[PDB]
Amino acid sequence: PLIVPYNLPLPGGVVPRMLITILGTVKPNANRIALDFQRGNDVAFHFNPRFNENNRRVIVCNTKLDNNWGREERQSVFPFESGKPFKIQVLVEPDHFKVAVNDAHLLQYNHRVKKLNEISKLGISGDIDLTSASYTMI
Ligand SMILES: OC[C@H]1O[C@@H](S[C@@H]2O[C@H](CO)[C@@H](O)[C@H](O)[C@H]2O)[C@H](O)[C@@H](n2cc(-c3cccc(F)c3)nn2)[C@H]1O
Ligand SMILES: [Cl-]
């Protein structure tokens, strides 16, 4: 597969109509996964499934600016399952990132970092076997 943590360059940043697809399998007994859309050292969009936060499964989304995390956005719809294959699709829309997992809409995250063409890397980390990571225009 691919080595995790994995860095996927996004040449020229992101733009509306760009679709990022991540395929992999959650490890048995996973604890956490993260996708980090990065603008240099800043994290424009952190998407962070947590499998055991006080015995609850939750997705935490946030932005990191100058090494400081901001206000978390939380989603208790939790489509991941330890040991199972998944597909994450992140569609860049004008106002938000739109995320679907296994072909079901999951959440939107409003753009806090607005220089979309500087969000030039995607980091993929945590407790997965990573099969592929790619992008296309729709
Ligand atoms: O806000 C989002 C932020 O949250 C804190 S935790 C937070 O701490 C505060 C302050 O104490 C509490 O108030 C919050 O209640 C709690 O949520 C995580 O450490 C951050 N994080 C996770 C990873 C990571 C790395 C590799 C793999 C992976 F899957 C995930 N790297 N950094 C990030 O998720
Ligand atoms: Cl975490």
UniProtKB/Swiss-Prot annotation:
Keyword Ribonucleoprotein: no
Localization, UniProt: Cytoplasm; Nucleus; Secreted
Organism: Homo sapiens
Lineage of source species: Eukaryota, Metazoa, Chordata, Craniata, Vertebrata
Primary site of residence: cytoplasm
Keywords attached to this entry: Acetylation, Cytoplasm, Differentiation, Disulfide bond, IgE-binding protein, Immunity, Innate immunity, Lectin, mRNA processing, mRNA splicing, Nucleus, Phosphoprotein, Repeat, Secreted, Spliceosome
Domain (Galectin): residue spans on this chain: 6-136
Cellular-component GO terms for this entry: cell surface; collagen-containing extracellular matrix; cytoplasm; cytosol; extracellular exosome; extracellular region; extracellular space; ficolin-1-rich granule membrane
Gene name per UniProt: LGALS3
Record's protein name: Galectin-3
